Scaffold this active site. Structure first.
Site, PDB file in Angstrom:
ATOM      1  N   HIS A   1      -7.077   1.552   2.049  1.00  0.00           N
ATOM      2  CA  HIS A   1      -8.107   0.542   1.852  1.00  0.00           C
ATOM      3  C   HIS A   1      -9.214   0.735   2.886  1.00  0.00           C
ATOM      4  O   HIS A   1      -9.066   1.504   3.827  1.00  0.00           O
ATOM      5  CB  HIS A   1      -7.528  -0.886   1.926  1.00  0.00           C
ATOM      6  CG  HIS A   1      -6.705  -1.160   3.146  1.00  0.00           C
ATOM      7  ND1 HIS A   1      -6.134  -2.391   3.390  1.00  0.00           N
ATOM      8  CD2 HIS A   1      -6.345  -0.367   4.184  1.00  0.00           C
ATOM      9  CE1 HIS A   1      -5.461  -2.348   4.525  1.00  0.00           C
ATOM     10  NE2 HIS A   1      -5.572  -1.131   5.028  1.00  0.00           N
TER      11      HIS A   1
ATOM     12  N   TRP B   1       0.840  -1.196   0.000  1.00  0.00           N
ATOM     13  CA  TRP B   1       0.000   0.000   0.000  1.00  0.00           C
ATOM     14  C   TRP B   1       0.877   1.248   0.000  1.00  0.00           C
ATOM     15  O   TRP B   1       1.536   1.528   0.999  1.00  0.00           O
ATOM     16  CB  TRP B   1      -0.910   0.050   1.254  1.00  0.00           C
ATOM     17  CG  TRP B   1      -1.895  -1.081   1.297  1.00  0.00           C
ATOM     18  CD1 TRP B   1      -3.114  -1.116   0.685  1.00  0.00           C
ATOM     19  CD2 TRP B   1      -1.748  -2.360   1.967  1.00  0.00           C
ATOM     20  NE1 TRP B   1      -3.732  -2.341   0.923  1.00  0.00           N
ATOM     21  CE2 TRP B   1      -2.908  -3.120   1.690  1.00  0.00           C
ATOM     22  CE3 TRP B   1      -0.733  -2.935   2.745  1.00  0.00           C
ATOM     23  CZ2 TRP B   1      -3.082  -4.428   2.160  1.00  0.00           C
ATOM     24  CZ3 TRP B   1      -0.905  -4.236   3.212  1.00  0.00           C
ATOM     25  CH2 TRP B   1      -2.072  -4.968   2.916  1.00  0.00           C
TER      26      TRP B   1
ATOM     27  N   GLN C   1     -13.370   0.902  -2.862  1.00  0.00           N
ATOM     28  CA  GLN C   1     -13.334  -0.493  -2.465  1.00  0.00           C
ATOM     29  C   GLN C   1     -14.625  -0.811  -1.722  1.00  0.00           C
ATOM     30  O   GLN C   1     -15.329   0.089  -1.257  1.00  0.00           O
ATOM     31  CB  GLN C   1     -12.148  -0.779  -1.540  1.00  0.00           C
ATOM     32  CG  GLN C   1     -10.799  -0.815  -2.234  1.00  0.00           C
ATOM     33  CD  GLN C   1      -9.709  -1.414  -1.359  1.00  0.00           C
ATOM     34  OE1 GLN C   1      -9.757  -1.305  -0.133  1.00  0.00           O
ATOM     35  NE2 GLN C   1      -8.724  -2.053  -1.982  1.00  0.00           N
TER      36      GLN C   1
ATOM     37  N   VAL D   1      -5.365 -11.633   7.953  1.00  0.00           N
ATOM     38  CA  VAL D   1      -6.186 -12.840   7.742  1.00  0.00           C
ATOM     39  C   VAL D   1      -5.411 -14.148   7.780  1.00  0.00           C
ATOM     40  O   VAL D   1      -4.418 -14.284   7.071  1.00  0.00           O
ATOM     41  CB  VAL D   1      -6.946 -12.748   6.384  1.00  0.00           C
ATOM     42  CG1 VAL D   1      -8.108 -11.771   6.508  1.00  0.00           C
ATOM     43  CG2 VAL D   1      -6.017 -12.351   5.240  1.00  0.00           C
TER      44      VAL D   1
ATOM     45  N   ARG E   1      -4.137   5.894  -2.977  1.00  0.00           N
ATOM     46  CA  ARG E   1      -2.817   5.291  -3.101  1.00  0.00           C
ATOM     47  C   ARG E   1      -1.912   6.088  -4.027  1.00  0.00           C
ATOM     48  O   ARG E   1      -2.303   6.463  -5.133  1.00  0.00           O
ATOM     49  CB  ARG E   1      -2.925   3.852  -3.598  1.00  0.00           C
ATOM     50  CG  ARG E   1      -3.628   2.956  -2.623  1.00  0.00           C
ATOM     51  CD  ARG E   1      -3.459   1.512  -2.975  1.00  0.00           C
ATOM     52  NE  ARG E   1      -4.422   0.717  -2.234  1.00  0.00           N
ATOM     53  CZ  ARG E   1      -4.598  -0.588  -2.384  1.00  0.00           C
ATOM     54  NH1 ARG E   1      -3.896  -1.388  -3.232  1.00  0.00           N
ATOM     55  NH2 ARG E   1      -5.534  -1.207  -1.676  1.00  0.00           N
TER      56      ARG E   1
HETATM   57  N1  LIG Z   1      -4.348   1.304  -8.706  1.00  0.00           N
HETATM   58  C1  LIG Z   1      -5.563   0.676  -8.652  1.00  0.00           C
HETATM   59  N2  LIG Z   1      -6.609   1.142  -9.449  1.00  0.00           N
HETATM   60  C2  LIG Z   1      -7.993   0.447  -9.436  1.00  0.00           C
HETATM   61  N3  LIG Z   1      -8.165  -0.572  -8.615  1.00  0.00           N
HETATM   62  C3  LIG Z   1      -7.109  -1.003  -7.842  1.00  0.00           C
HETATM   63  C4  LIG Z   1      -5.805  -0.487  -7.770  1.00  0.00           C
HETATM   64  N4  LIG Z   1      -5.015  -1.213  -6.855  1.00  0.00           N
HETATM   65  C5  LIG Z   1      -5.957  -2.203  -6.506  1.00  0.00           C
HETATM   66  N5  LIG Z   1      -7.135  -2.087  -6.937  1.00  0.00           N
HETATM   67  C6  LIG Z   1      -8.307  -3.015  -6.608  1.00  0.00           C
HETATM   68  O1  LIG Z   1      -8.282  -3.232  -5.164  1.00  0.00           O
HETATM   69  C7  LIG Z   1      -8.662  -4.640  -4.900  1.00  0.00           C
HETATM   70  C8  LIG Z   1      -7.992  -5.061  -3.551  1.00  0.00           C
HETATM   71  O2  LIG Z   1      -6.920  -4.138  -3.153  1.00  0.00           O
HETATM   72  P1  LIG Z   1      -5.497  -4.696  -2.541  1.00  0.00           P
HETATM   73  O3  LIG Z   1      -4.620  -3.560  -2.139  1.00  0.00           O
HETATM   74  O4  LIG Z   1      -4.922  -5.623  -3.548  1.00  0.00           O
HETATM   75  O5  LIG Z   1      -5.950  -5.585  -1.246  1.00  0.00           O
HETATM   76  C9  LIG Z   1      -6.541  -4.688  -0.234  1.00  0.00           C
HETATM   77  O6  LIG Z   1      -6.676  -3.453  -0.337  1.00  0.00           O
HETATM   78  C10 LIG Z   1      -7.020  -5.388   1.027  1.00  0.00           C
HETATM   79  N6  LIG Z   1      -7.376  -4.471   2.092  1.00  0.00           N
HETATM   80  C11 LIG Z   1      -8.213  -6.273   0.624  1.00  0.00           C
HETATM   81  C12 LIG Z   1      -8.618  -7.289   1.625  1.00  0.00           C
HETATM   82  C13 LIG Z   1      -9.688  -7.045   2.530  1.00  0.00           C
HETATM   83  C14 LIG Z   1     -10.063  -8.000   3.485  1.00  0.00           C
HETATM   84  C15 LIG Z   1      -9.392  -9.231   3.577  1.00  0.00           C
HETATM   85  C16 LIG Z   1      -8.329  -9.486   2.684  1.00  0.00           C
HETATM   86  C17 LIG Z   1      -7.944  -8.533   1.722  1.00  0.00           C
HETATM   87  C18 LIG Z   1      -8.168  -5.412  -6.134  1.00  0.00           C
HETATM   88  O7  LIG Z   1      -8.860  -6.650  -6.338  1.00  0.00           O
HETATM   89  C19 LIG Z   1      -8.263  -4.409  -7.309  1.00  0.00           C
HETATM   90  O8  LIG Z   1      -9.336  -4.666  -8.241  1.00  0.00           O
END
Ligand SMILES: Nc1ncnc2c1ncn2[C@@H]1O[C@H](COP(=O)(O)OC(=O)[C@@H](N)Cc2ccccc2)[C@@H](O)[C@H]1O
Ligand SMILES: Nc1ncnc2c1ncn2[C@@H]1O[C@H](COP(=O)(O)OC(=O)[C@@H](N)Cc2ccccc2)[C@@H](O)[C@H]1O
Ligand SMILES: [Mn+2]
Lengths: 266, 785, 233, 157
Positions: free
Chosen positions: C61, C32, C101, C144, C87
């Site tokens: 997130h 992140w 999200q 998790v 981000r």
């Molecule tokens: N730069 C971006 N632009 C658009 N969507 C994005 C970007 N970075 C990620 N995402 C979206 O954010 C989703 C998840 O974000 P991540 O940073 O990968 O994981 C998370 O943010 C974790 N907090 C999710 C989580 C929650 C609860 C339990 C377990 C895991 C992805 O499936 C994706 O579709």
């Protein structure tokens, strides 16, 4: 400069009828529980309204509903699968017939809630209507028990009146349910029990009429090894208690001064 | 991390194919971002022996005499071209990967070059084109097609998450595969050591930065090119082979997530010192970059008498000076475990990202150094004819891992599965765990290479992924939610209803970034933002917005530039920051307005925006009033504050002309409120059925006096029986005092239980006449119609 | 059975990272790219209105709401928290520094991973029809213990799209929650319960669902773009 | 009898079975936001109104009506809306009104209708004189409604 406190363009501001609001909340409450809202036709055949629901003709049980019979040729009443159906036409006396329409057109398990306008031939006073609305509930599938019906009403009461609310179940009769019951919810704010509606475990014969109608239509039986519960509650009364409406006749009265008072409830 | 199929197959011989491998890894928790075939070698590329390298007088080129079955000559300008090595000979006719035309016999500076010797880049096995590929002179019989000893390879681009640093080694990956059921073949470290004393010492001056540190001793080294199998392996993994010793240290690193470095003893002196660096202490790293060290940097140093000097940046990159070259004869092998945090900062500090820093940052097996020494020393003996000491210099004593709780029953309970106890335990054992006990709760102690296995939960995930996440059934939970979760969604629902009504009323939603241009606090006239960004995306987004309207205005402009909207009614809801994070609702009005598109008359500007807002609040069932108040960003003449249910919640008016001008925009109208709006609990009022009394009356008042005071005054005194009260006409003219206004008021009275007598209505208008005059106002009208 | 609740866009490092088992100076936190903030006078309210402190940032997130909610409530429950997240990264045609999200959290006795899979299956069915399916693969998240990444089969496009991450709430998250409760006078409420959580990124799902080719269009403000969605009531 | 809640994956053909109901409720909500006020009128019709309002007679009649003014089932929605405007103008004196109603109509087949009514001086500045009303005003709201629904709307004579 300008008088910014002067009334602006008189654009119109709309609103939803109180029954629409009460129906919406009821539907939202059950949607949260997995129920899906489906509607049925206001004009039904005697078969769906009565016969399929184990309510035969010339019997005391049918007196529980004062029917509005209809006449007229050229009218096409469509059944559960678009097939044209026949039978003495009438104005549904309750939403219950949708229990049958839905089950022939679908397979268990499922959870539905059918809101709808119902009709009954009787004098209208300050707390009675010949035209009103009901909300039916039907949940079918393996292992569905009465404990689940009580669970549903408990959730209904909680959502409607808060944590100091409670439900009461007492035996009562309906041809379409074997344990049969009548339920009330405690309304804290008013410190009294209001009778919401009837419910029970779907009668054996309802499932049979459903599968028999299926067979007569080419579909395979789908309700021999399942149980289920159903309930039906009358919207107006709940709405009256909830919006503080004293006269049930106001609903279909059409008076704007009455309707307008519900714009706030978005 | 690059995963060369044939290399992994050396540890997991039964692998079905690259595709199946990708599937196995995915189920293990490793996603492959790409799979590719990488070593194209034409038939024309053969192995040759350089019999001799003759300089071509007057040039920077050499004439190579090659044994390629038959002797041939080739011209080369590669500094490393020399006698005694094996090379990759592209014979005339050969077509090379990437090259346009074929390779032919060519005359160069007086000599006929029969083909050409290749660089890794020309052969297509690596990016390096600065020199020729160097093979052992006896690698293959002269002239044999190179492909025969260098088959094509398939390489998987594996994503290896933080929690699996052991997976940063091919052998670690193989162990995961072994748990799945595959046979595992661990390399046997055949070593013929010797009981001799090490000609050097070890001094760990900073055991905090280097908790475990070992030194191996290999001498009598015959530095030379790595065998073909190793060069293919390293190239496939994205690394360039250098020689015997160096390649072995890279190979073992890639095999077992254990970075290690060979230090030429010639430069070690009396010993190795693992210590912090001294202010400004210089060090020329392996990459050729001349660096200056920081006191927080851990270094590997040597010492001679009273001399102390840096040999390499510990856990990141070795020094250029003690690199292991052709004349090297003996070395001190560094195999250690450094402090992750320390390595992390150092790497950042010098902008270095190396295969070594990466692994130490993620974590290395705390008790893997000694086993890693045997592996490397073993390979050195086999490939560099090294002589090895039986003893190691060792500092630090890492504690083995502790036992963890393990309830089969809980594993199944947490997953919702029903794996047999025996399968669960057999799995943990295949992964290298120790399982002790009999009862329901076992004592499982994980192998030291597993830094991610500390909690029982960790162990259930081991069981789940090995069994396979697909074997977890699907279910839905059932339960009566705890009492305090009731209606917890009211707020969210409230706001979404508002957006929906707004979209129905006619407003168009817009989404604008939460960022604000610090400079706009000026352009738009408003207090500066309270929150700023330490690391903004750009200076135009270095702060957090304080208002919603500024963005809406900039949206109107950007729209008017790309397209030419003749008008627009927008709205946006978002978080604003100022002393506290709060939710705002803002709307914008622009264009000719509303009316007949084929006609001329129209309703627009201020009073139009005020119309929509009054409709909105009428629809929400909330009192809405707008009293004039000044706002820097609004036009002084068209500016007021918004009140809902008697409570200031925002503003309404026209954008300030001066601001409009600077932004090069026509007049703009807008508002902004603070959410959530007040809740007005229902209080049903039974409408009276008896007839209502009608009656008009105009009011003469000064031009300045706002309609609000009049309406308020009339209403207040109108009496407990006032039902309606509307303004149907505003007149400012000749019939009466100059600089005055008359307000046409439609009034209505009504009684709940009975009808109103003609006297009561008069007694009511009376109060509206007495209290009306007391304020210096008069009434022209006095009856209806 | 899920209820929607929102959290604040400006969070403290404690809720965004620390309480979620994501300590500082560790590889896990690199997942992140934070947007750090500065500025005095800003009051960040905690789960129970109490003023809280800590290095302010823009939530990376929605996950921190998992912690805020649990301190302010008692199990069992089902929540879903939608929200704007931030981000620090370059924005292209398929990447944003500002996006949304949707978090999911279900806690209570006997809650199992089978239930998490059940939820996603229902999500996929509702979103793409009966010919849709879900895929679960191991992946890492400090908050998790089984950890996972899930994808849904999109029939119409014949391809697997990665929707988000999920897993069984980590032991340490429940502990941080009850520790924060104790430090606040409330009794522990999560010692004998389990639960699952998930988080999916809205824009990508919306893009695939509305056929939007450029993710930058969302915050672009262009009316010709926005107007094309009036039909979806 | 204890309290419990059921759990199960609903059978495949129960999917999105609520789309129709949701579709209609969204319509009512938009209409209420656009500016229209909802009204509920009895499904009964006065047989005599088929004449007063000029339209084909009702196809369904009641064997046992509540009164002769309700001996048939409505064929249109607007007649009731008009009678509502009148009843309103008598009790109260609305200077205008923008109503709407959704309900079941009966004629050869039971079908759902949406009807709207416009009356009064119109829309404009309450303190001024110029105004937008009548036909083209009602057509304005309808065009907005269909613009909001994302549907092509045209009106040919
Ligand atoms: N730069 C971006 N632009 C658009 N969507 C994005 C970007 N970075 C990620 N995402 C979206 O954010 C989703 C998840 O974000 P991540 O940073 O990968 O994981 C998370 O943010 C974790 N907090 C999710 C989580 C929650 C609860 C339990 C377990 C895991 C992805 O499936 C994706 O579709
Ligand atoms: N004249 C009336 N005016 C307003 N509401 C009425 C009137 N008659 C009944 N109701 C409402 O209608 C509700 C139920 O109607 P009843 O005719 O009593 O039962 C029924 O109509 C059954 N079909 C309900 C049912 C469904 C499923 C299983 C079991 C039972 C009552 O609780 C009451 O609030
Ligand atoms: Mn794990």
């Amino acid at each position: 400069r300008v008088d910014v406190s002067l009334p602006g363009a008189s654009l119109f501001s709309g609103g939803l009828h109180p029954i629409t609001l009460m129906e919406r909340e009821l539907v939202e409450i059950f949607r949260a529980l997995g129920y899906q809202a489906v509607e049925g036709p206001e004009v039904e055949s005697e078969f769906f309204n009565f016969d399929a629901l184990n309510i035969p003709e010339h019997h005391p049980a049918r007196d529980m509903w004062d029917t509005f019979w209809l006449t007229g040729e050229g009218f096409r009443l469509e059944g559960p699968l678009g097939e044209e159906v026949e039978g003495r036409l009438l104005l549904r006396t309750h939403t219950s017939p949708m229990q049958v329409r839905y089950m022939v057109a679908h397979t268990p398990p499922f959870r539905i809630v059918v809101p709808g306008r119902v009709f009954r031939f009787e004098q209208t006073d300050a707390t009675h209507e010949a035209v009103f609305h009901q909300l039916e509930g039907l949940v079918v599938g393996e292992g569905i028990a009465m404990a689940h019906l009580k669970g549903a009403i408990y959730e209904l009461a909680q959502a409607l009146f808060g944590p100091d609310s409670k439900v009461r179940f007492q035996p009562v009769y309906f041809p379409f349910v074997e344990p049969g019951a009548q339920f009330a919810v405690w309304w804290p704010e008013g410190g009294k029990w209001l009778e919401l509606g009837g419910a029970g475990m779907v009668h054996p014969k309802v499932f049979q009429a459903v599968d028999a109608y299926r067979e007569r239509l080419g579909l395979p039986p789908a309700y021999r090894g399942v149980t289920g519960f159903a309930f039906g509650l009358g919207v107006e009364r709940l709405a009256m208690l909830r919006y503080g409406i004293p006269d049930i006749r106001y609903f279909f009265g059409g008076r704007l001064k009455f309707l307008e008072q519900f714009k706030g409830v978005l | 991390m690059r995963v060369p199929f044939s290399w992994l197959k050396a540890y997991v011989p039964e692998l079905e194919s690259p595709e199946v491998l990708e599937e196995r890894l995915a189920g293990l928790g490793f996603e492959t971002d790409r799979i590719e075939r990488v070593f194209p070698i034409p038939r024309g590329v053969v192995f040759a022996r350089v019999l001799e390298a003759h300089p071509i007088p007057g040039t920077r080129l050499k004439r190579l005499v090659l044994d390629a079955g038959r002797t041939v000559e080739v011209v080369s300008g590669a500094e490393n071209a020399r006698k005694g090595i094996g090379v990759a000979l592209a014979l005339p006719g050969t077509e090379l990967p990437g090259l346009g035309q074929k390779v032919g016999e060519r005359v160069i500076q007086g000599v006929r070059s029969f083909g050409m010797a290749l660089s890794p880049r020309e052969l297509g096995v690596g990016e390096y084109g600065g020199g020729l590929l160097e093979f052992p002179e006896d690698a293959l019989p002269p002239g044999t097609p190179l492909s025969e000893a260098w088959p094509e390879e398939v390489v998987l681009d594996l994503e290896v998450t933080p929690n699996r640093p052991d997976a940063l080694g091919l052998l670690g990956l193989a162990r995961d595969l072994h748990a799945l059921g595959y046979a595992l073949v661990e390399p046997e470290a055949a070593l013929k050591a010797e009981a001799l004393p090490l000609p050097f010492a070890l001094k760990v001056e900073d055991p905090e930065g280097a908790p475990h540190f070992t030194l191996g001793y290999a001498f009598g080294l015959r530095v030379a090119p790595s065998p073909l199998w190793m060069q293919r392996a390293l190239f496939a993994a994205g690394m360039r082979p250098i020689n015997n010793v160096v390649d072995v240290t890279n190979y073992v690193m890639l095999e077992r997530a254990q970075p290690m470095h060979a230090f030429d003893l010639r430069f070690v002196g009396e010993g190795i010192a693992v210590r912090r660096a001294r202010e400004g202490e210089r060090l020329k790293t392996l990459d050729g970059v001349e660096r200056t060290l920081h006191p927080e940097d851990l270094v590997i140093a040597g010492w001679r008498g009273e001399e102390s000097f840096p040999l390499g940046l510990a856990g990141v990159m070795g020094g250029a000076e003690s690199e292991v070259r052709e004349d090297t004869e003996a070395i001190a092998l560094e195999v250690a475990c450094f402090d992750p945090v320390s390595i992390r900062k150092t790497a950042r500090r010098h902008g270095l990202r190396t295969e070594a820093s990466h692994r130490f940052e993620r974590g290395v097996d705390p008790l893997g150094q000694v086993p890693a020494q045997r592996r490397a020393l073993s390979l050195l003996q086999a490939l560099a004819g090294a002589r090895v000491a039986e003893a190691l210099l060792e500092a630090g004593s890492p504690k083995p891992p502790e036992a963890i709780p393990f309830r089969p029953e809980y594993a199944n309970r947490l997953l919702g599965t029903s794996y047999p106890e025996a399968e669960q335990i057999a799995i943990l054992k295949r992964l290298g765990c120790r399982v002790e006990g009999e009862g329901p709760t076992y004592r499982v102690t994980p192998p030291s290479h597993r830094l991610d296995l500390r909690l029982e939960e960790d162990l259930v995930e081991e069981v789940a992924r090995i069994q396979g996440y697909e074997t977890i059934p699907l279910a839905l939970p059932a339960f009566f939610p705890a009492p305090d979760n009731r209606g917890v969604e009211a707020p969210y629902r409230k706001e979404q209803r508002l957006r929906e009504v707004l979209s129905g009323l006619g407003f168009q939603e817009v989404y604008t970034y939460s960022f604000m241009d610090p400079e706009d606090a000026r352009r738009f006239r408003l207090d500066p933002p309270r929150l700023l960004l330490l690391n903004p995306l750009a200076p135009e987004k270095a702060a957090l917005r304080t208002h919603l309207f500024p963005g809406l205005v900039r949206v109107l402009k950007e729209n008017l530039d790309l397209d030419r909207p003749e008008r627009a009614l927008l709205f946006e809801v978002g978080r604003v920051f100022r002393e506290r994070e709060e939710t705002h609702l803002a709307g914008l009005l622009f264009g000719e307005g509303v009316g007949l598109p084929w006609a001329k008359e129209r309703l627009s500007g201020y009073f139009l925006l005020k119309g929509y807002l009054e409709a909105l609040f009428a629809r929400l069932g909330l009192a809405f009033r707008v009293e004039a108040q000044a706002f820097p960003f609004l036009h002084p003449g068209v500016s007021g504050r918004v009140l809902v249910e008697g409570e200031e919640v925002g503003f309404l008016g026209a954008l300030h002309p001066e601001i409009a001008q600077e932004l090069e925009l026509p007049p703009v109208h807008l508002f902004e409120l603070r959410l959530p709006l007040p809740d007005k609990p229902l209080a049903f009022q039974d409408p009276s059925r008896h007839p209502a009394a009608f009656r008009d009356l105009a009011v003469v008042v000064p031009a300045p006096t706002p309609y609000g005071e009049v309406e308020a005054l009339v209403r207040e005194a109108a009496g407990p029986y006032l039902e309606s009260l509307a303004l149907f006409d505003l007149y400012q003219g000749p019939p009466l005092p100059e600089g005055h206004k008359s307000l046409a008021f439609h009034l209505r009275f009504r009684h709940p239980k009975r009808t109103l007598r003609d006297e009561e209505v008069e007694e009511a208008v009376s109060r509206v006449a007495e209290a009306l005059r007391a304020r210096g106002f008069g009434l022209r009208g006095l009856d209806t119609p």
